[PDB]
Amino acid sequence: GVEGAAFQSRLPHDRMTSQEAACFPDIISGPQQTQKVFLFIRNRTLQLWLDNPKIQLTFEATLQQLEAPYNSDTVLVHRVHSYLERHGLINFGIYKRIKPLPTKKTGKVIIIGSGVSGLAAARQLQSFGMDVTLLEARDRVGGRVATFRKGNYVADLGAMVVTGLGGNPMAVVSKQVNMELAKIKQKCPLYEANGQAVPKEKDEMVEQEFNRLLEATSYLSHQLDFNVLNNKPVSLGQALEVVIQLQEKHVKDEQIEHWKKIVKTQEELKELLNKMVNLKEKIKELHQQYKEASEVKPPRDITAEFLVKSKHRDLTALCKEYDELAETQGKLEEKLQELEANPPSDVYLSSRDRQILDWHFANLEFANATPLSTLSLKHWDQDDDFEFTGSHLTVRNGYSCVPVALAEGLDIKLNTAVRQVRYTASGCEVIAVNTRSTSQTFIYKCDAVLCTLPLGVLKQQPPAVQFVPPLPEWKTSAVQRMGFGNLNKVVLCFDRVFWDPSVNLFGHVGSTTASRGELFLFWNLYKAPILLALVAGEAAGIMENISDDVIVGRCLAILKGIFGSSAVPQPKETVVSRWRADPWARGSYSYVAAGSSGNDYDLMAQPITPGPSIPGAPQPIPRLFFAGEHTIRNYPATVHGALLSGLREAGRIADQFLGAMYTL
C-alpha cells in the first residue's frame, strides 16, 4: 500500500532520507511520533500520484484524500506536497494539467541537449514557471534513445531495455506514454563458431564457473586487498586473469602431488621387491644346505640331527617372512592400480571451455559497454544494490516514443550545435551555430545553463564545447577519470522468420578471446522479422572502421552456420550504429573505470559558481548545472538514470531561482 509507494519511489518507508532531513530539519530532529506522521503523509501522497499518474496531483486534491488526524495539519501536508512536487517525485512526466500554466514566466534557463535528461528537466522547469529553451545539435530529440523506423520495421539503436518496473520511474512514464512493453524470455542458447549448439551440461558448467570467477575477484579485492599493482588501479580484467592463472596452477599442483604419491608408493615397492629378491636367495641357499644335511642318512649323531632340524626350522621361518612380504606386495600393487585409475583433472578449462567463457565475458563487456581491462575492480558493481525488481522488458513500439512525447510543448532548437558556454556573476550566454550552415551564429542569454552533454563530448580533445571561464580542475579531473564506453548494434531486417520464435535471444561464440564481443549476441524482439546483433568490448571500437557490407557479411555467415546456408535470405534493410564516431555522443554510456569511483559521479553532478565580476562583491549564485547519465551514481548508464538526473537538476535550479517556500 503506502509501503509500495515508497519502494516505487526508491525511498525507505519507515525512515526519513537525507534530502528530507534537509528540508524538514524540525521534523527529523523532533520526536519519533511526528516523524511517523510525516512518513505517512509522504507515502500516501506518493501512493495517490502513483495510483493515477495521468493527471496532476494538486495540494487541494491531496488534503481531500487524507483522513484524520493526518489531514488536520494543513501546513505540514502543503510542505510535504510541495517538497515532492519540487523534487519531481510526484507530477513529473506527461500528465494532464489541472491548473493551466500561468502565462507569466520567472527566470530564463538554457538546456544543452534534448536527450532524456534534458527533456525531463525542461518539463519540470516549464511546469515550475520558468522560461526554458533547449538546444539540440541533432535533427531530432532523444539523443542516445535512437529508434530506427522504416515501414513496419522498428529497431532501437540506443537504449532498448527497461530493466525492471519495481522502483523504476519508467513505470510511471509507461502509463503516461503508450509503451508496448514486452517481457524478455531469459532462455538464451549459444552456438559455437562451427554453428553447433552448446549442450545443456557445458552451458551450465561454464556459466557457474563464470559466476564463480567473478565472486573470486570480489574476494581478491575485499579480502586480499589486491587493488593496486605497479602504482596502477587493478582492473576487473587483470583480476580475472590472475584468478584463472591460479586455477590453472591448482590443477597443475594437484597433478604433481598425485604423481608424487605414485612414486612414493612405487618406491615402497622397489624396497619391498629388493627385500624379497634377497630373501628368495637366502631361502634358496638354505634349502640347499638342508638338502645336504638331509643327505647324511640315519642313524646319525645328535649334531648332525640338530643340523637337519635347525635348518628345517630356519627355513620355515624365512618362508613365513617371504609370504608376509608377498602379502604386502599385493597390497601396494593394487594401491598403484587404484591411483593410476584416479587421475585428477587434466586442464582447468579446455579450448572449447575457454571460448564459451569468453562469451560470458563479452556479455559482461556488453553490459558495461567496455573491455573488462578498463573496469575498476573495486567499484565496477557499485550500483548493484539499486537494481530494480521485475522482469526486463523491451519497447516494442520503439523507445523514441518516450522522448518524442516528452518534447510536446517545449521550445526546442534542433540543428543547433552549442559551441561556447559563458557564465558570470550576472548571468550566462551560450554561443551555438547552425549545423547545416556553421557560419550562422546564435546567442542565448540566460540566468542559468543546464549542461547535459554526454561524458564523451565533455572528454573531447581538443574540446568541442568551450567553457568560459574554463571548468575547474576538480570538474575536469572527474571528466578525465570517468570511463566512457562503447557498444554497437547491427539491425538486420528480413521478409520472413527463420529463427526460433519463442527464443528472444541467442548467442554466437567467437573463435578467439580478441573477437569475443564481435556479433556475439542476437536479439529477436519486434513485431516484424528483425534480428539485432551486438558488438561489444574491444570489437565495438575496431568494427566502427569496418564498412556495413563487410559487417553484414559476417552477420550472414554466422547465421548461415546456425540456420543453414539455404535459409538465410539477403536482408531487405540494414543499419549499423557507430556511437564512438558520433560527434554528439562519442561513445555509448559511462562505466566505472579503474582509478575512478562512485564519487566522480557526484563531482560530475555539482553545479559551478562563477567568481565575482566586481572585486569584493558578494558570493554569486551557481550558474552552470549538470545532468545526464554520467551525473547519477546510483543509476548511471541508463534511461531512468538520465531521467532522474534531469528531475534532480530541475529541483535544484528552481530552488535556486524561484526560492523554496517549504524549507521554512
Partner: peptide
C-alpha cells in the same frame, strides 16, 4: 551493472 538479463 552485471550481466543485465536477470531479475
Amino acid at each position: 551493472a552485471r550481466t543485465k538479463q536477470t531479475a
